[PDB]
Design a protein around this nucleic acid. Sequence first.
RNA 1: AGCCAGGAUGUUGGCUUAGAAGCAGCCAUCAUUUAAAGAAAGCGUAAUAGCUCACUGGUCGAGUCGGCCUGCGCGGAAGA
Lengths: 141, 38, 176
Amino acid sequence: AKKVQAYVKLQVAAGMANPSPPVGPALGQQGVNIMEFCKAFNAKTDSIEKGLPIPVVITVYADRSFTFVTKTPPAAVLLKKAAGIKSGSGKPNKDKVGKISRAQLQEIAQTKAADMTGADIEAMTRSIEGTARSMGLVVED
Amino acid sequence: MKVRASVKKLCRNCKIVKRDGVIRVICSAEPKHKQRQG
Amino acid sequence: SRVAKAPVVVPAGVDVKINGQVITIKGKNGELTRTLNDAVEVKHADNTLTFGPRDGYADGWAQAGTARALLNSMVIGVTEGFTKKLQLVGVGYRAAVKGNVINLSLGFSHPVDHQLPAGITAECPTQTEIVLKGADKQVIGQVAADLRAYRRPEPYKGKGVRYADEVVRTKEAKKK
RNA sequence: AGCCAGGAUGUUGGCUUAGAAGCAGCCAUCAUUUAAAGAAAGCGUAAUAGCUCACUGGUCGAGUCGGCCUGCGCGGAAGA
């Protein structure tokens, strides 16, 4: 974006019960206090996308007011469930063995069709290929 | 500091010059790193 | 060696006497500035000057790039003047100057006084600036280096005699 | 190398985690515009920033940078 306000990021682990960022001094400099966002907010994300982890970011306004907004669920989240195994190959910084076919890329290319409407699937199978070798995954070219 | 005959490399933040025959080393950011002979 | 192979240009309106003993120059900012001959000889047969070894002296070719620097400064000292750099910093310490004789108050029972060399003018235009004027870049550097003989500023408070050019800064509660 | 003049747009990137706008890890490290540029080099901050830089332009100007190999020198160097 040509103009951006760059609001504080609030990433914390799954199923975590006592998080430290939602009381940190960065929210102090943003000028807000967070009450409900990190302990049961799994229900407030399940109320906007199910069976798929969605990213959420803060937007801040006057009178210490705040609103939470969604992003595109990253292709990595789909790749970590594409082969019917837990986290795919798991952690990065790992020996590579798990290979993604152009048929598997063409299954997740369907995520682009609502913006890439020109009805070419081989094109969307390359426009989904951005950093596809992340998470220690192997790619078919 | 110490009187030394080795300069080598020790800190990447050092600034080195040869002055009056000897090597002189001073470091802006990393602590205690200094040399007056080398 | 690099710089003695290349020329320097004579600025318009500058007047030189440069073909025998004693080089004399004048311009916008200095009058009757002269220097005695040494091991380097300058060629004046074009509006650009070049340096080489003077006959009747030794090892002047290794000095030709150095002669160029002193000559360029000898033109600057009669066309525009030099860069001011000397300062005295911290509350309770300040310079005094007659024009003419200069003194520093910097927490010593030493005199810390200078009568000045011939043709040198001294000024102290603020609580922390000192200025030296002349046509020899080395004399206005060395008079400042006698003024920088006591009260060296420390990395705990930074109080004393300093240049506008440093290798030390103050550090508070430092590591450890 | 120097001097002056340039330090973004895609970019609010994705993964892991304790957080991290280059700024300790992992995916990479390209396309675009121009007078002109690293998802980053370093110091630095709670983090950006601050910057000092990487990288180009103009200028000047012809050799030069890091190693490999082969020789000669320097500092290494106190005692009656």
